[PDB]
Short mmCIF file of C-alpha atoms and ligand atoms in Angstrom, two decimals:
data_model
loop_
_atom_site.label_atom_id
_atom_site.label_comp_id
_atom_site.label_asym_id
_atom_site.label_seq_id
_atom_site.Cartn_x
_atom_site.Cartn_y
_atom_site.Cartn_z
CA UNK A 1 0.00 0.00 0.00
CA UNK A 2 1.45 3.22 1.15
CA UNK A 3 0.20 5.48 -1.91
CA UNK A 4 0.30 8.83 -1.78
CA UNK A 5 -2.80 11.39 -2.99
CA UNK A 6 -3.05 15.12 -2.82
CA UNK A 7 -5.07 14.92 0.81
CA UNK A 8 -1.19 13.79 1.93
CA UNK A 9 0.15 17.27 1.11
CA UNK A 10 3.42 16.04 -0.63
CA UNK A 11 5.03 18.93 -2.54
CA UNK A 12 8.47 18.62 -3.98
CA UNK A 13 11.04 21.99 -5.71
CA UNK A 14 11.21 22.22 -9.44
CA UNK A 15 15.24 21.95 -8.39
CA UNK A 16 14.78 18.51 -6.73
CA UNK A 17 13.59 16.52 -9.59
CA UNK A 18 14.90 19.24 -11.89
CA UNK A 19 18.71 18.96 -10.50
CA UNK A 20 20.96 17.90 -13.70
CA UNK A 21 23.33 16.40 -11.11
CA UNK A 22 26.58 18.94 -11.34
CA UNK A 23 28.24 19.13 -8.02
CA UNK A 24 31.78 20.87 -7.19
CA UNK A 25 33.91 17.83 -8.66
CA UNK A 26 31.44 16.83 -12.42
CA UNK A 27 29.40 18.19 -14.52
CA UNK A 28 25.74 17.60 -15.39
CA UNK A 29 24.80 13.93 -15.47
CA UNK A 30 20.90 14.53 -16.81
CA UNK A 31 19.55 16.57 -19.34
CA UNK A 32 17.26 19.75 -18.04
CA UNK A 33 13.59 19.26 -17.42
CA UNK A 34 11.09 21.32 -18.66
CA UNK A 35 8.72 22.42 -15.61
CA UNK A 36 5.86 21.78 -17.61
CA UNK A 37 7.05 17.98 -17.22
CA UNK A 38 7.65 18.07 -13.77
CA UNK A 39 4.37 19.37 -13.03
CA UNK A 40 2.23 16.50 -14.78
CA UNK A 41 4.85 13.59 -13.59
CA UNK A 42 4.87 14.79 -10.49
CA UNK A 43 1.00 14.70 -10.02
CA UNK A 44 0.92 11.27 -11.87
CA UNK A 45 2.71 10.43 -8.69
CA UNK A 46 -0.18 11.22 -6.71
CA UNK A 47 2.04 15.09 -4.54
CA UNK A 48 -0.22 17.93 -3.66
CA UNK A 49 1.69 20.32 -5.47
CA UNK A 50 4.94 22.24 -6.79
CA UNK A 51 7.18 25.12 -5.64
CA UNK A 52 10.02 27.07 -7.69
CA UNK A 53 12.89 29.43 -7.31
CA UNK A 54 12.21 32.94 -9.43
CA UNK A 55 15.35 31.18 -11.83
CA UNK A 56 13.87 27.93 -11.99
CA UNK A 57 10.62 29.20 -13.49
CA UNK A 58 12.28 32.49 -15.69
CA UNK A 59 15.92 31.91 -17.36
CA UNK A 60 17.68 34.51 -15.63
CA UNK A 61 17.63 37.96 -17.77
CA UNK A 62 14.94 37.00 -19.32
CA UNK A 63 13.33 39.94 -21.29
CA UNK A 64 9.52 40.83 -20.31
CA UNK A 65 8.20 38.88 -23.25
CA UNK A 66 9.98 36.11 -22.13
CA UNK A 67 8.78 35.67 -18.78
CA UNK A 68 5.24 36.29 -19.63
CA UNK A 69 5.61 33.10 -21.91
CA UNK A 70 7.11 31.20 -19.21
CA UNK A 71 4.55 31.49 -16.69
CA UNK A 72 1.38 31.70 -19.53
CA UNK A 73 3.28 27.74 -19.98
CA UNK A 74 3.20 27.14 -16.34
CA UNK A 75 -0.15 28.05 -15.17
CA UNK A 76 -1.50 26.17 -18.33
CA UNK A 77 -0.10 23.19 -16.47
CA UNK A 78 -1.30 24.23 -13.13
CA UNK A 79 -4.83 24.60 -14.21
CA UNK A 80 -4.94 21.23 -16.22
CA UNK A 81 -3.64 19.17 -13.36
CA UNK A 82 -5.20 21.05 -10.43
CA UNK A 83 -1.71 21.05 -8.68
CA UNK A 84 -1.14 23.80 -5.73
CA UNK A 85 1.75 26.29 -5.68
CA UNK A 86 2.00 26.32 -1.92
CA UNK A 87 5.39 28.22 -1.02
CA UNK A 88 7.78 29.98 -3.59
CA UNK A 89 11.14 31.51 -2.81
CA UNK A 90 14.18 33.82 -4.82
CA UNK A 91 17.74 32.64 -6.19
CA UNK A 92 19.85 34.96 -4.07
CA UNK A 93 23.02 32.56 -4.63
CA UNK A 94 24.02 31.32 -8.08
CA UNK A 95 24.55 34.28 -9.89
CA UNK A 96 28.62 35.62 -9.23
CA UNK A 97 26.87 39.07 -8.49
CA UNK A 98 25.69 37.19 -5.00
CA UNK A 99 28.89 35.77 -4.18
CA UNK A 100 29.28 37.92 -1.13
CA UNK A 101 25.63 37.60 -0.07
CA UNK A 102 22.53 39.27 -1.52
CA UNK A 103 20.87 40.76 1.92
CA UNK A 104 24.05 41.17 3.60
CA UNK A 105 26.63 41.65 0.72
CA UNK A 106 29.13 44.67 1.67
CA UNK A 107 28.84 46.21 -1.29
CA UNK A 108 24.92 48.18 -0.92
CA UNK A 109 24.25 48.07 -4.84
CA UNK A 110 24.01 44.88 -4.40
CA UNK A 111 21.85 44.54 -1.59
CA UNK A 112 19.01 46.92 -3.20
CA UNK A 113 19.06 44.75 -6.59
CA UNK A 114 19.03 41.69 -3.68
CA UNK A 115 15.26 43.15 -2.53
CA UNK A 116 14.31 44.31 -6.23
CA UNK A 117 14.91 40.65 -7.45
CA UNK A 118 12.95 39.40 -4.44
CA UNK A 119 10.16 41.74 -4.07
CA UNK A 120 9.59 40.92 -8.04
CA UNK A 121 8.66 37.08 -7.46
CA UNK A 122 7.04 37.54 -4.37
CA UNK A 123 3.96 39.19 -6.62
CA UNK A 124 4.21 36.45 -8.91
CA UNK A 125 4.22 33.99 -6.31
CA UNK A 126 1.08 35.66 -4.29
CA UNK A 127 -0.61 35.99 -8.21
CA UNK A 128 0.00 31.80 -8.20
CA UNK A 129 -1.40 31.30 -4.72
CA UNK A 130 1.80 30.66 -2.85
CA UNK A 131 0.97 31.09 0.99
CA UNK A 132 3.85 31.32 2.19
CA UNK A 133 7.68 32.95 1.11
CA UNK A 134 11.18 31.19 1.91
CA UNK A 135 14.67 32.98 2.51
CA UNK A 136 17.46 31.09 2.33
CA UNK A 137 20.32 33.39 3.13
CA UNK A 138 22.91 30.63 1.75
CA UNK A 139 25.31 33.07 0.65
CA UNK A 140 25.29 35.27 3.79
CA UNK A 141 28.34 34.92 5.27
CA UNK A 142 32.36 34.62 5.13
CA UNK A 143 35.07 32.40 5.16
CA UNK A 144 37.03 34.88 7.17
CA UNK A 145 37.27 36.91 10.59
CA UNK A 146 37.78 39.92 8.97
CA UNK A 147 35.49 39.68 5.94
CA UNK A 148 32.08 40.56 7.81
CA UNK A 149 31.02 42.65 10.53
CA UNK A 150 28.57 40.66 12.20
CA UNK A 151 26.52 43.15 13.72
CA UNK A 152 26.24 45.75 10.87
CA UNK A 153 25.40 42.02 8.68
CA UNK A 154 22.33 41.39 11.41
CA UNK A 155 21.19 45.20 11.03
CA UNK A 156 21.05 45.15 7.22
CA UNK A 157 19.10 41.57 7.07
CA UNK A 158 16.82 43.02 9.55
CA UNK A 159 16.66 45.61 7.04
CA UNK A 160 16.16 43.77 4.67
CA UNK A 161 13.21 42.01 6.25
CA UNK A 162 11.27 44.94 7.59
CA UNK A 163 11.54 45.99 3.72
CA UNK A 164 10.06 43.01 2.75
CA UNK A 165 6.76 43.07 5.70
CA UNK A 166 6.37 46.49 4.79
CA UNK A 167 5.98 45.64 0.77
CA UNK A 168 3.61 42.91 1.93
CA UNK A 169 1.95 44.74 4.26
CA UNK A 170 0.63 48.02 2.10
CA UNK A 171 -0.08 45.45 -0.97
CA UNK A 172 -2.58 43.52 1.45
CA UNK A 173 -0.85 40.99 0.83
CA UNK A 174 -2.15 36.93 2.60
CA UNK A 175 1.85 35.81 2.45
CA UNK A 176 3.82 34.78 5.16
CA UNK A 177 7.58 34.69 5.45
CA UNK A 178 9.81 31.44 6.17
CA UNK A 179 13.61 31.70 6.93
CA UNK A 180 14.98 28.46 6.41
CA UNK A 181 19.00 28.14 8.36
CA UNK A 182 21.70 26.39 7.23
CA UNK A 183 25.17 26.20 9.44
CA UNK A 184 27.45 26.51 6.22
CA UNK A 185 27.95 25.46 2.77
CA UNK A 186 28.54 27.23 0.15
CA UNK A 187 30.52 29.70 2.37
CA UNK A 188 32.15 28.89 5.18
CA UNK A 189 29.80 30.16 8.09
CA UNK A 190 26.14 30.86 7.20
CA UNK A 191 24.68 33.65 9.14
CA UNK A 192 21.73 32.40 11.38
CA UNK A 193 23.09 29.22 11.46
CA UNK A 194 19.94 26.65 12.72
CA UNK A 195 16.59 26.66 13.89
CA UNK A 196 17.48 28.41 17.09
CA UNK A 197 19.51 31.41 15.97
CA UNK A 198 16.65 32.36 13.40
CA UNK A 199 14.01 32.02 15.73
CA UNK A 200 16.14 34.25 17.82
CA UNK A 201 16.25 36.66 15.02
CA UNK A 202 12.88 36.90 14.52
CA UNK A 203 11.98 38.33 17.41
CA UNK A 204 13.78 41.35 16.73
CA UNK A 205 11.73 42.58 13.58
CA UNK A 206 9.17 44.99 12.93
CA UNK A 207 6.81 42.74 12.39
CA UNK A 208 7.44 39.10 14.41
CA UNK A 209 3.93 37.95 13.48
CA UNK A 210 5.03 37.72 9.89
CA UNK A 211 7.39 35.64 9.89
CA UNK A 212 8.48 31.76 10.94
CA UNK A 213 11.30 29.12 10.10
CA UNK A 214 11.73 26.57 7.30
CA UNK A 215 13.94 24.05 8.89
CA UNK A 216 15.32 20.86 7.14
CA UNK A 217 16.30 17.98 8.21
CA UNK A 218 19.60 17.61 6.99
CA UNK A 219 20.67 21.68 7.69
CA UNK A 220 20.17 21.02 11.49
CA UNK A 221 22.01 17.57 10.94
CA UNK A 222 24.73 19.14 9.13
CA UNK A 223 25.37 20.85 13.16
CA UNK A 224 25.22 17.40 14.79
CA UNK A 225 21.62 18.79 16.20
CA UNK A 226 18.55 16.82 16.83
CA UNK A 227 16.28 18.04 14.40
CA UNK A 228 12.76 16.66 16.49
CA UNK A 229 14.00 18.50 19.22
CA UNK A 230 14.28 21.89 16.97
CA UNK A 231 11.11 21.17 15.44
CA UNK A 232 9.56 20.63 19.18
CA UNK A 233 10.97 24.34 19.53
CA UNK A 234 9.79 26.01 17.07
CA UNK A 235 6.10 24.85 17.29
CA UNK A 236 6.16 25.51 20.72
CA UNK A 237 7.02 29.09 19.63
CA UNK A 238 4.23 29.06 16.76
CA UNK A 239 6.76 29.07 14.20
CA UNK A 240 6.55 26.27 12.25
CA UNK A 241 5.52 27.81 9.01
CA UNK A 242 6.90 25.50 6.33
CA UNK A 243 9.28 22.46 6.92
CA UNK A 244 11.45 20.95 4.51
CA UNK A 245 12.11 16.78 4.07
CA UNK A 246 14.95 14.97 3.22
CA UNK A 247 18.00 12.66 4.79
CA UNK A 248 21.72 12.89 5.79
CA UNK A 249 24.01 11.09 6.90
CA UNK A 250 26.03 12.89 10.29
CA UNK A 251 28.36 15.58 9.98
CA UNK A 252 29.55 16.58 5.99
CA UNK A 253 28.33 18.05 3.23
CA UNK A 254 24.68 18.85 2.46
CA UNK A 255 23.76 15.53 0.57
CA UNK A 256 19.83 16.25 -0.02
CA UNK A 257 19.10 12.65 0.46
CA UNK A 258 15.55 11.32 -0.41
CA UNK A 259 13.36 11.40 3.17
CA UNK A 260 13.61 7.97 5.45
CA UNK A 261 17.29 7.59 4.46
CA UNK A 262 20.27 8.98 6.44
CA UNK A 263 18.84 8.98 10.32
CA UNK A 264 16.15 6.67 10.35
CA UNK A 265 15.18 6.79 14.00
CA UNK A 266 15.28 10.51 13.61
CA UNK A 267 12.63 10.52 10.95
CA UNK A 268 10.51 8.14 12.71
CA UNK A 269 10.15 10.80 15.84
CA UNK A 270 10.01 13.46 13.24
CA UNK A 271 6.84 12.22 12.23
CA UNK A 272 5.13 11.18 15.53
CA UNK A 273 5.97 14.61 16.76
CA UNK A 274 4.33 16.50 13.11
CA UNK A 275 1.45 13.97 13.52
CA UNK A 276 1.04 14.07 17.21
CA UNK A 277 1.24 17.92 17.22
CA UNK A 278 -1.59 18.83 13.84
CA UNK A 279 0.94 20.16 11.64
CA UNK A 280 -1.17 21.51 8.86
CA UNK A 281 1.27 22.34 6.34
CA UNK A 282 3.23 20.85 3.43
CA UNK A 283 5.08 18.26 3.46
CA UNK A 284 7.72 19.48 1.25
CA UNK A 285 10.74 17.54 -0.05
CA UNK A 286 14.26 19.25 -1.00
CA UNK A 287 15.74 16.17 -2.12
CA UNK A 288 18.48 15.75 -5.09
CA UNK A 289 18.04 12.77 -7.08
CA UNK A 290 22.10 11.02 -6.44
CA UNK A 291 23.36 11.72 -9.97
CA UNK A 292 24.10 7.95 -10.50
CA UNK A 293 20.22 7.77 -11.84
CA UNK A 294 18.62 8.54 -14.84
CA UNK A 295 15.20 9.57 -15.05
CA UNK A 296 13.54 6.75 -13.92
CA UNK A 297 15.51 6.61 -11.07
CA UNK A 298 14.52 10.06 -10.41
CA UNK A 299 11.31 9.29 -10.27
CA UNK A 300 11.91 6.53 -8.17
CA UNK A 301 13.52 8.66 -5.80
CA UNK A 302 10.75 11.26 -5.55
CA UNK A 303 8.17 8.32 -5.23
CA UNK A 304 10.18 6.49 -2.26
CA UNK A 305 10.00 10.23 -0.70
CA UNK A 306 6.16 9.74 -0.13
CA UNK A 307 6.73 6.14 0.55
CA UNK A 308 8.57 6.81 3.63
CA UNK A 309 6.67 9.19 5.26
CA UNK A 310 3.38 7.21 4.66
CA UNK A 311 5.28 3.89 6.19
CA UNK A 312 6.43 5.71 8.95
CA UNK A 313 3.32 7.80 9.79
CA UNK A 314 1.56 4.22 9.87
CA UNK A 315 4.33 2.63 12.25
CA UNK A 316 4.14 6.13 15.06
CA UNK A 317 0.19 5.94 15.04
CA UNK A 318 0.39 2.10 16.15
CA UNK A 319 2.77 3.07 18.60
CA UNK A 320 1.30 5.93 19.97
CA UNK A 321 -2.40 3.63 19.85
CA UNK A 322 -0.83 0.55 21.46
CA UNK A 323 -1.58 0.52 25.22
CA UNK A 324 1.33 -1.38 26.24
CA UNK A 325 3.16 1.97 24.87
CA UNK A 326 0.55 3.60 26.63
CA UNK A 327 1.63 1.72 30.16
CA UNK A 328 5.76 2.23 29.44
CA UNK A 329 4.26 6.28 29.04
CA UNK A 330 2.89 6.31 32.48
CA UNK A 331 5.96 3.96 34.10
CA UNK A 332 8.12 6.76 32.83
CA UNK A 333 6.51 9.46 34.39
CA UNK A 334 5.29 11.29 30.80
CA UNK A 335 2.58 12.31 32.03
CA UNK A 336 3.91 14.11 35.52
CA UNK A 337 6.33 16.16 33.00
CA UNK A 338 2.64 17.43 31.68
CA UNK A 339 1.75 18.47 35.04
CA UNK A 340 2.84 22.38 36.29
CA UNK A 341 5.75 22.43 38.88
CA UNK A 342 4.28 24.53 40.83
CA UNK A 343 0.90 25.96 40.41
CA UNK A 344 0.58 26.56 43.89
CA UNK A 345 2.72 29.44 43.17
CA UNK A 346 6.14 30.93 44.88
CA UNK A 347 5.13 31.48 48.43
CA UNK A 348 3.52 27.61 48.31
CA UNK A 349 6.51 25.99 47.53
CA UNK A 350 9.38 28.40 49.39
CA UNK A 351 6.62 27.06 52.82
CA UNK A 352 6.57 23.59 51.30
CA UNK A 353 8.93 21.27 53.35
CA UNK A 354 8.55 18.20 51.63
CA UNK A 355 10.25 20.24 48.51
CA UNK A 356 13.54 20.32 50.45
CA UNK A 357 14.11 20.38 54.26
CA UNK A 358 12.00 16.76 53.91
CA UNK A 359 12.46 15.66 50.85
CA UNK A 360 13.70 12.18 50.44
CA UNK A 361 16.76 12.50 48.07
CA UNK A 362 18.08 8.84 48.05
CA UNK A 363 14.32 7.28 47.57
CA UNK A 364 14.19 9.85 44.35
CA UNK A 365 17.12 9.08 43.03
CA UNK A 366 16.77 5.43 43.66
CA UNK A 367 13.71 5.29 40.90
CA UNK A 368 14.60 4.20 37.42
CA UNK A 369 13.02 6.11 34.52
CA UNK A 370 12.64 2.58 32.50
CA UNK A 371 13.25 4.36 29.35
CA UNK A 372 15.03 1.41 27.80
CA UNK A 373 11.79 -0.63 27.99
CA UNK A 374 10.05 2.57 25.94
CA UNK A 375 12.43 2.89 23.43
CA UNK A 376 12.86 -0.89 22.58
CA UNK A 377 8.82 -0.82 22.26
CA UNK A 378 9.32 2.07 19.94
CA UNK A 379 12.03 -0.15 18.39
CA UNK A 380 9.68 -3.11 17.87
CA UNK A 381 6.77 -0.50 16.71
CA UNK A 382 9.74 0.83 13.89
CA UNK A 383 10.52 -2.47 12.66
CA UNK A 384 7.08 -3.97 12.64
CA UNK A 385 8.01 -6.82 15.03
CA UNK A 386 5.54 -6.46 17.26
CA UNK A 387 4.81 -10.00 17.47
O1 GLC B 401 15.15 28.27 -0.06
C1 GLC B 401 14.75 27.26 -0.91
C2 GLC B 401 15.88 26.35 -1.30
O2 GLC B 401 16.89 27.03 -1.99
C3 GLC B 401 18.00 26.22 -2.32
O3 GLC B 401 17.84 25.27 -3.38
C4 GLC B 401 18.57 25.57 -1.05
O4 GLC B 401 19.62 24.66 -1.35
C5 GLC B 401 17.49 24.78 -0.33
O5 GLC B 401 17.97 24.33 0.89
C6 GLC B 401 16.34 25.69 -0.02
O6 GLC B 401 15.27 25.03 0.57
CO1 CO B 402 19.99 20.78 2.03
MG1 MG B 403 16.01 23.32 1.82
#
């Protein structure tokens, strides 16, 4: 079983299935697709819907005419397929202009084309019924001390985002924005390097409301981080506006594996946590195809995306439904961490005796939290050997 249809809110990137497979050391192992082809095999495969990059959509320097024809192309597909464009974002890092950074280069020519480019797409994307913008910021940054001012950096992305709330803003505008953190790669540091430093951020703009995070799996990975544990952060801040799917394995480069390889485990709690918690949005795979495959093995790839999360949403429900989970729960004390500390407030507990002057220490420490027992039934639930 295990087939995906659009109620399962798969998307996947025009790049992911679109990626001709150069990386720093080869060149291009697969011919370009045309996005009209990605669109209709990608909802033969039963996803929700597509998102793009400005340049994925629109050669870059494309005249007018051009881009008109482009997207005339494009929604023709949309509209025969019924696919969704649910998030849409800018290419702020392949072009050599953006080699130092396109909110944050040094040089400020660059920074105003940076928000031209940007605000530009964002009306296209609103026009296609994106709701909700991604930033990537993977060029922001340095491979040197000296190279960046790290301060004066934060103050012109903050700039840079109060621009964009305000353009959003006085068009009436239903978009949200996403800022999706990577630790480094292409340059050596990334600015706002995971999950926590951008929700950090945040909280400094005009306009906090406005925007969220776009984690992915393998970015917060790529720090040695857990990435359920960031995840459990940022929807208990409310910030969970967009997430993005894939795998990798530890510590290297980005790899942009399909979703379910790399950290298995951590993709199983991944998905008991978006499950257990009502995430409502999409499901959205950055992925790159290996470049050992041809197009059927890109397809493949894309397929065994949905695959995944559909096997492993089916193994967390059983073991969240199983009451033998349900007794391991309450044997390690889940349920006290629900209750408040102390909601018999200050004075209560400073008077309360048995907190301290008679509390048993050795009988406390003398319980075992029989965690081992949970996570081999979690174990057994993974491998489907509950038998
Ligand atoms: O921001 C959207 C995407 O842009 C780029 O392709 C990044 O590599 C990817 O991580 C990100 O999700
Ligand atoms: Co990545
Ligand atoms: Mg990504």
């Amino acid at each position: 079983n295990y087939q995906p249809t659009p109620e399962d809110r798969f998307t996947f990137g025009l790049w992911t299935v679109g990626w001709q497979g150069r990386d720093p050391f080869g060149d291009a192992t697969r011919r370009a697709l045309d996005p009209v082809e990605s669109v209709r095999r990608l909802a033969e495969l039963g996803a929700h819907g597509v998102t793009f990059h400005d340049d994925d959509l629109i050669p870059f320097g494309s005249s007018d005419s051009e881009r008109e024809e482009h997207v005339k192309r494009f929604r023709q597909a949309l509209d025969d397929t019924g696919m969704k464009v649910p998030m849409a974002t800018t290419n702020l890092f392949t072009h050599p202009v953006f080699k130092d950074g396109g909110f944050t280069a040094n040089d400020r020519d660059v920074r105003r084309y940076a928000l031209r480019k940007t605000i530009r797409n964002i009306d296209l994307a609103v026009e296609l019924g994106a709701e909700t913008y991604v930033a990537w910021g993977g060029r922001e940054g340095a491979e040197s001390g000296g190279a960046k001012d790290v301060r004066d950096a934060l103050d012109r992305m903050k700039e840079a985002f109060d621009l964009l709330g305000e353009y959003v803003t006085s068009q009436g505008y239903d978009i949200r924005f996403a800022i999706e953190p990577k630790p480094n790669e292409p340059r050596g540091d990334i600015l706002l390097p995971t999950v926590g430093h951008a929700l950090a951020f945040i909280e400094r703009l005009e306009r906090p409301e406005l925007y969220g995070v776009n984690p992915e799996v393998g970015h917060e990975q790529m720090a040695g981080l857990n990435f359920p544990h960031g995840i459990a952060q940022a929807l208990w801040a409310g910030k969970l506006f967009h997430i993005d799917l894939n795998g990798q394995n530890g510590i290297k480069y980005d790899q942009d594996l399909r979703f379910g390889a790399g950290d298995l485990r951590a993709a199983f709690w991944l998905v008991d946590l978006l499950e257990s918690a009502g995430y409502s949005g999409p499901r959205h795979f950055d992925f790159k195809p290996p470049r050992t495959e041809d197009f059927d093995g890109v397809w493949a790839s894309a397929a065994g995306c949905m695959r995944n999360y559909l096997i492993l949403k089916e193994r967390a429900a059983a073991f969240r439904a199983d009451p033998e989970v349900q007794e391991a729960l309450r044997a390690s004390r889940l349920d006290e961490l629900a209750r408040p500390t102390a909601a018999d407030g200050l004075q209560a507990l400073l008077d309360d005796r048995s907190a301290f002057e008679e509390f048993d220490v050795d009988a406390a420490a003398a319980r075992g939290m029989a965690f081992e027992r949970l996570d081999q039934l979690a174990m057994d639930h993974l491998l489907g050997a509950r038998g």
